[PDB]
Design a protein around this ligand. Structure first.
Ligand SMILES: *[C@@H]1O[C@H](CO)[C@@H](O)[C@H](O)[C@H]1NC(C)=O
Lengths: 46, 48, 48
């Protein structure tokens, strides 16, 4: 059914496109919306 | 007499050294508590 | 508070003493189960 979203904001320091850092971070849910939508693809928006 | 007494004292003083070290000397007493805790943990974990 | 009372929190039943929490709950969750499916803390629906 519904569409769940998990996220966490964290300030880091890294080479700016490269080497996604180490460590651990738990992603907390923010908003759940009760839709009945079938999703097969998704398109990012820059 | 003094040699036997000194050997007995040196063997008794090494018992506390051999018991406080190696971290697994009292395994036969720890395993009973581990089994009695594992059974009580399994009895609650099968209620779900 | 501080009394054995029957409750009904959003469908689930149970019997217990509904005292204070003294907890550190994150605001996205409701239940507070410790080991098994027993309910330690359940959030209020009006006062939250
Ligand atoms: C109704 O529920 C809301 C929960 O957001 C609570 O803030 C409010 O005080 C409640 N009102 C009454 C009259 O219980």
């Amino acid at each position: 059914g519904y569409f769940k979203i998990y996220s966490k904001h964290t300030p880091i320091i890294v080479r700016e496109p490269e080497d996604l850092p180490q460590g651990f971070s738990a992603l907390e849910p923010l908003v759940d919306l009760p839709i009945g939508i079938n999703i097969t693809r998704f398109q990012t928006l820059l | 007499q003094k040699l036997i007494a000194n050997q007995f004292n040196s063997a008794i003083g090494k018992i506390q050294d051999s018991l406080s070290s190696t971290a697994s000397a009292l395994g036969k007493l720890q395993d009973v508590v581990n089994h009695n805790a594992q059974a009580l943990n399994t009895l609650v974990k099968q209620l779900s | 508070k501080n009394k054995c009372v029957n409750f009904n929190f959003n469908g689930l039943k149970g019997t217990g003493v509904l005292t204070e929490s003294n907890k550190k709950f994150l605001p996205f969750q409701q239940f507070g189960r410790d080991i098994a499916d027993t309910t330690d803390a359940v959030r209020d629906p009006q006062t939250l």
